[PDB]
């Protein structure tokens, strides 16, 4: 009736509450590992950035994006999509390498023409050098990485363990090395294959850091989202409780009408 329709919907809400609780807790567990990775990685990355800065960082482009395969990230997938979308007005023909299914869906809508490479098995794992390296090896061959004047990577920088700002950076190519001239304030021999090697090595080193930052932000957002869900569900629980109680009183009052029938006897 009323009573049952309240109760079944309330049960749905309850079950959801339990699931979001469960998810949030498991998310916290995952979050520590995700965050841990980004510190070590970020420390490693900065040392290379020290070179690139001092060298000067001076520049069809590539877009790489990072999400997990897994969903319930939060709005990571579509906020990242939005920060891509602005620069997909600035490059509507950009070739997108999608590291993760979730960003793939949003971008796939925006231009399926752009979708050229995608990588599975991302979301399941926590970012690893093996993956980054293999992706790097494939990037050169598949995407013809060298063609772009500079690559660009989009990821989610985990600003705080309650926040995420989607962030991007440009991966510096051999072209960058070529026309940066304060590379000469780090001079090495022509015999050294250091431009073509350093390009590849920091192609991956930058990418891994971006992935770690993204993964931590993703898991962080998921925790935040699942916490807020639990809260929203509580409010609805309370609203249906008040309705339930009033309905219970009204059924008792109708029973009191039956008592009044007994009074007629």
């Amino acid at each position: 009736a009323t009573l049952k329709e309240v109760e079944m919907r309330l049960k749905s809400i309850k079950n959801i509450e339990k699931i979001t609780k469960t998810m949030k807790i498991v998310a916290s567990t995952r979050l520590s590992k995700a965050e841990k990775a980004k510190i070590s990685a970020k420390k490693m990355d900065e040392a290379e950035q020290l070179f690139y800065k001092n060298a000067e960082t001076k520049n069809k482009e590539l877009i790489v994006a990072i999400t997990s395969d897994k969903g319930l990230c939060g709005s990571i997938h579509s906020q990242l999509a939005k920060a891509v979308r602005r620069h997909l007005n600035d490059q509507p023909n950009a070739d997108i390498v999608t590291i993760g299914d979730k960003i793939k869906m949003q971008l796939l809508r925006t231009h399926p023409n752009n979708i050229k490479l995608s990588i599975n098995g991302i979301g399941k794992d926590a970012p690893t050098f093996q993956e980054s390296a293999l992706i790097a090896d494939k990037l050169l061959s598949v995407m013809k990485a060298g063609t772009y004047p500079k690559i660009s990577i989009f990821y989610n920088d985990p600003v705080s363990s309650l926040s995420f700002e989607p962030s991007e950076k440009p991966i510096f190519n051999a072209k960058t090395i070529e026309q940066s001239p304060s590379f000469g304030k780090f001079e090495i021999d022509t015999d050294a294959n250091v431009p073509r090697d350093l390009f590849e090595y920091t192609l991956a080193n930058q990418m891994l850091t971006a992935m770690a930052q993204g993964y931590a932000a993703e898991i962080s957002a998921r925790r935040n989202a699942m916490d807020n869900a639990s809260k929203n569900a509580g409010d609805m629980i309370n609203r249906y409780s008040i309705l339930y109680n009033r309905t219970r009183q009204a059924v008792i009052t109708n029973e009191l009408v039956d008592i009044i029938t007994g009074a007629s006897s």
């Binding site: 990775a37 070590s40 990685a41 420390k43 490693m44 040392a47 290379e48 020290l50 070179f51 001092n54 690893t128 050098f129 304030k185 780090f186 001079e187 090495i188 021999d189 050294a192 294959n193 250091v194 090697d197 350093l198 090595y201 920091t202 080193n205 891994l208």
Partner: protein, 120 residues
């Protein structure tokens, strides 16, 4: 100095002398060094912080002296002693792999890594 770094751990990212195996032969850095980039090959490495010397087996990476005497080192994974028998097992695999042949690079690297570890 020395700012030895791996993605999974950071080993030094001061460290008075670092001895590095490079495509530029062997490079030693003590205090300030002239401002260079050197690609680190798969390596046997010595790192000295003071006179104390630590002996490392390294998967190659990159080395880049910053002109502020900050030796930015990036490599994938390291101790030499921890690595030092399975490498012999690996040699059997590597020989087998060479029989068939990226596989060429794999077998070549496995033999190379073994030789380089074997060197110490």
């Amino acid at each position: 100095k020395l700012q030895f770094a791996l993605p999974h751990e950071t080993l030094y990212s001061e460290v008075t002398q670092v001895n590095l195996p490079a495509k530029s032969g062997r490079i030693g850095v003590l205090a300030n060094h002239v401002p260079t980039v050197e690609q680190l090959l798969p390596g046997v490495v010595e790192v000295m912080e003071g006179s104390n010397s630590k002996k490392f087996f390294i998967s190659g990476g990159f080395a880049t002296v910053q002109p502020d005497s900050q030796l930015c080192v990036t490599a994938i994974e390291a101790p030499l002693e921890s690595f030092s028998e399975n490498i012999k097992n690996l040699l059997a695999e590597a020989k087998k792999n060479v029989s068939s042949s990226r596989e060429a690079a794999e077998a070549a690297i496995q033999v190379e890594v073994l030789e380089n570890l074997q060197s110490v």
